[PDB]
Amino acid sequence: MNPPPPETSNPNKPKRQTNQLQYLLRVVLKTLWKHQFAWPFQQPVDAVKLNLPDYYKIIKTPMDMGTIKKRLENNYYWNAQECIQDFNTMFTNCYIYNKPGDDIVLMAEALEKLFLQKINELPT
Ligand SMILES: Cc1nnc2ccc(N3CCC(C)CC3)nn12
Ligand code: NA
């Protein structure tokens, strides 16, 4: 079955708009989003649709770019590192649930390299 997706709002959580978080939405996320390999990551993994009944029996901190995009648009993060950690969790989840050489893993590897290329230099 599917668990509920990660939260994109939390009224008690402190939030910030920074130049780096603006950039993570305008440049980093919106560039990755258009990549030919982005589509499996644009929404939470649907274990019922995709017939992966063990996905959430294995993956305990799910993350995806649709959640990340909604968090950025909702001003959910305190700083850029928090959002970067969500991207890293998304990539590592894919490596954990699958194995080397899988098509989905090749996709994640390419996106992760583009991601790191984009956050190598951030605005001040
Ligand atoms: C996201 C994600 N993380 N692990 C997986 C395993 C499979 C999967 N799908 C099947 C094939 C893929 C090209 C698209 C959907 N997605 N997936
Ligand atoms: Na950059």
Author numbering: 43 to 166
From the paper:
BRD4 contains two tandem bromodomains (BD1 and BD2) that recognize acetylated lysine for epigenetic reading, and these bromodomains are promising therapeutic targets for treating various diseases, including cancers. BD1 has four α helices (αZ, αA, αB, and αC) as the skeletal backbone, and they are linked with three loops named the ZA, AB, and BC loops. The Kac and inhibitor binding site (ligand binding site) of BD1 is formed by ZA and BC loops, and most interacting residues reside on those loops (yellow and magenta in Fig. 1a,b; the key residues are illustrated as sticks). We characterized the binding modes by determining the crystal structures of BD1 in complex with four selected inhibitors.
While substitution of only the piperidine group at R1 (13) showed no blocking activities, but surprisingly, introducing 4-methylpiperidine restored inhibitory efficacy. The N1 nitrogen atom of the triazole of the core scaffold forms hydrogen bonds with Asn140. The compound 14 contains a piperidine group at the R2 position of the scaffold instead of indole, which does not interact with Asp145 and Ile146 to form hydrophobic interactions but still interacts with Trp81 and Pro82. Two hydrophobic interactions between the core scaffold and Leu94 and the core scaffold and Tyr139 are common features in 5, 6, and 12. These hydrophobic interactions are not found in 14. The compound 14 showed a retained conserved water with the WPF motif, but these water molecules did not participate in water-mediated ligand binding. The compound 14, the smallest compound in this study, showed that the surfaces of the compound and binding position of BD1 were electrostatically complementary as well.
